[PDB]
Amino acid sequence: AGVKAYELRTKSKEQLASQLVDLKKELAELKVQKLSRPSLPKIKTVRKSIACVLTVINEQQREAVRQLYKGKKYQPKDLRAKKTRALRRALTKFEASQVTEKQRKKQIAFPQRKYAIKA
Q: How many residues does the chain have?
A: 119
| DSSP H or E segment with residue 2 | none
70 contributes a contact to RNA by CB under 7 A: no
Q: Positive or negative CA dihedral for 18, 23, 26, 31?
A: negative
The reply on whether position 109 binds another protein by CB under 8 A is: yes
116 binds, among RNA, another protein, none (CB under 5 to 8 A by kind): another protein
Q: Phi, psi (5° rounding) for residue 36?
A: -105, -15
What is the Cα–Cα distance from 27 to 35, expressed in whole angstroms?
13
Q: Which 8-state DSSP code applies to residue 91? A: P
> At its nearest, how many Å lie between another protein and the CB of residue 35?
19
Asked whether the beta carbons of 4 and 51 are under 8 A apart, the reply is: no
20 binds, among RNA, another protein, none (CB under 5 to 8 A by kind): none
Among 10, 12, 67, 84, binds another protein (CB under 8 A): 84
> Min. distance of Cβ 108 from another protein in angstroms?
11
Which residues would be at the binding site for another protein (CB under 8 A)? 81-84, 87, 109-119
Which residues would be at the binding site for RNA (CB under 7 A)? 1, 4-6, 39-44, 47-48, 50-52, 54-55, 58-59, 62, 74, 77-82, 84-89
